[PDB]
Symmetry: C3
Subunit: 39 residues, 3 copies
C-alpha cells in the first residue's frame, strides 16, 4: 500500500531522529558537565 509505504518511511525517518536527538542531548549535557565540573 502506498499509504503504508509513506507511514513506514516516516518511521525510519522518525527512528533516525530519536538517535540523533539522544546523541546531541548527551554531548550537550556532557560538555556542560565538562565545563562546570573541572576547569
Amino acid at each position: 500500500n502506498i499509504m503504508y509505504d509513506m507511514i513506514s518511511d516516516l518511521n525510519e525517518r522518525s527512528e533516525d531522529f530519536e538517535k540523533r536527538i539522544v546523541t546531541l542531548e548527551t554531548k550537550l549535557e556532557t560538555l556542560i558537565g565538562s565545563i562546570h565540573a573541572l576547569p
Copy 2:
C-alpha cells in the same frame, strides 16, 4: 484501524521530538550566551 494506530504513534513520537528539540536548542544558545556574554 491499524494504519491509524501507526499514524497516531508517529504523532506521539513526533510530538516528543518537538519538545526535546526546543529544549536542546535553548540550552545550546544559552550556554553560548553564557560564554560570550560574561566570562
Copy 3:
C-alpha cells in the same frame, strides 16, 4: 483522504525536524571545535 492529510502533516513535521537537528548538531560540534582548537 483524512489519513493522507495526517501522513502529509507528519512529513512536513518530520522535515522541519531534520533541519533543526542538522543545525543543532553543527552548532554543537562547532562550539566544541571553537573551544578545543584555540583558547
